[PDB]
Write a protein that binds this ligand. Sequence first.
Ligand SMILES: COc1cc(CCc2cc(Nc3ccnc(NCc4cc(C)no4)n3)n[nH]2)cc(OC)c1
Ligand SMILES: COc1cc(CCc2cc(Nc3ccnc(NCc4cc(C)no4)n3)n[nH]2)cc(OC)c1
Lengths: 281, 282
Amino acid sequence: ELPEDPRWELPRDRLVLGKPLGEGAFGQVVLAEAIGLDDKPNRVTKVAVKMLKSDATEKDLSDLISEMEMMKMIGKHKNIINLLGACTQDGPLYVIVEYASKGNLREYLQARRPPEQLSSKDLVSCAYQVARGMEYLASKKCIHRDLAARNVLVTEDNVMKIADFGIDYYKKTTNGRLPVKWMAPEALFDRIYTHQSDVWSFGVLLWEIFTLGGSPYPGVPVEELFKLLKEGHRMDKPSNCTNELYMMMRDCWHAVPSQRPTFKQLVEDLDRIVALTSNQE
Amino acid sequence: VSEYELPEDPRWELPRDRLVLGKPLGEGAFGQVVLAEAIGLDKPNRVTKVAVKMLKSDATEKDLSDLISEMEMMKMIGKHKNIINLLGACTQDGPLYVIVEYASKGNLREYLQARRPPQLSSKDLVSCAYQVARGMEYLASKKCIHRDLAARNVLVTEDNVMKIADFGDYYKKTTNGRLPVKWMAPEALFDRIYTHQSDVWSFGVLLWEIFTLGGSPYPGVPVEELFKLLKEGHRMDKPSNCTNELYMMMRDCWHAVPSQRPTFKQLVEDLDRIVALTSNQE
Ligand SMILES: COc1cc(CCc2cc(Nc3ccnc(NCc4cc(C)no4)n3)n[nH]2)cc(OC)c1
Ligand SMILES: COc1cc(CCc2cc(Nc3ccnc(NCc4cc(C)no4)n3)n[nH]2)cc(OC)c1
């Protein structure tokens, strides 16, 4: 049995499960409809539901509870996937969260590549939102550890929402990419995970945005990536990316972690650049 | 026959006392290259600063054969401004010295690297591409396929003139530590078919090298992984400070179907037009 929390608990008869969305962290994610989440008790809200797979262990359960328990503490923000409720009693654990219909930022940016289109201002606005979301998480003393476009979900209203916050190097993703390519060197070589190692990952995410879902270091294996980092190599400036925005990526990848910008600084600069970026191209 | 004596060609032959050897320039193809001074090449008493290619002391009868062949080919190919031309030779009574034009500003890659901002204008960069294409178009008309067209094999003269050099194993790297497979067309790299259209692809990689101001192609990418990129039909990212017309030209050179790539005559025509429309103000 799991303990009951009435602040969040939803009766199972108020949740109609739909088509699966795909595999998530610590379990699988399905589309659902929740009858009366707030008044109105008669309104349906389209939501996302995470539960365990049939092959899951007592360890996989504890992980899912822990993530839910953390979301309770972290609190609400527009640019994070928020908790909406849970079915913890009389059956399997269903963690009810916000639903993002346009998938992950990688897929979204890829699907909108030229032969719907995004202007330069729209791309800067994507970076702004992720930084706003990360700055909130940082204020809650939370370190993501895997900030990438794949872990940023886009809603129907093009709002960016950071997913699964708070590992073998030769383990690839579903799309066949290597997650080591997003890691700060100190996290990779010294296993030191800080808000400053997440800032390095935001630098890789920025590159991902301005390349419209480009794969970082294509054809580069793990042993060769270490060689690039040790040599102090940095990714080439994307085409259709300002010198101010490349300067920003390079600051995020400052060799010295203490010399990198913070998320509060990134939010400030990105706010200013959005305002000065034309929506005419 | 060439073991004891080489045949004489008086159209090119120079007396050895008319050549004063100087500081070595580096290792070249089929031998080594040294700086030299030739007393009266034309007509008389004037010294011309030249480049001299000869064999290393450890060279074989096969290495000699190769050097003679390159000289013999240069005799056939004829003169052009955008190629390293033959000036003469010492073939008799001592080791073979192949006397050629001298390019003081080194190779295009080093040239472009040394001139990176912390200068060459956009028009200067397009002019580099134009010259290489003019040089390759001349070589193509002479039924010659380079097989290793890269910035490293393009010499730049005192007067900034581009000159193609040494015009004809996958895990063999260069002196600067780069992999030459990163310049070859897929047909040359899988079916071993080397054509003028293969040199058009290598010109595509050279153009990328120019607009990245001596950028290293696919950094940290090994050979087996490069094949995977080519088979997947991956194409290098558009460089920063490179027009969409110039990137599309790179992409045209990088066409999977060799017959659908532009020829050097087309490249010369388009570049001629672009140089004229490119501002020297930036
Ligand atoms: C901390 O953030 C989360 C995020 C999630 C992901 C829920 C989700 C899926 C979704 N929409 C889409 C769109 C396209 N493809 C998918 N696939 C499933 C998926 C995405 C992610 C991220 N994890 O699983 N979901 N929006 N919101 C679940 C969760 O449960 C404890 C907490
Ligand atoms: C078919 O084209 C050639 C090109 C050459 C290149 C000779 C050369 C070198 C040179 N100037 C410099 C300047 C700085 N560093 C070097 N390095 C030697 C070098 C580079 C390359 C390429 N070949 O030799 N050469 N000017 N002309 C020789 C030759 O003799 C058979 C035939």
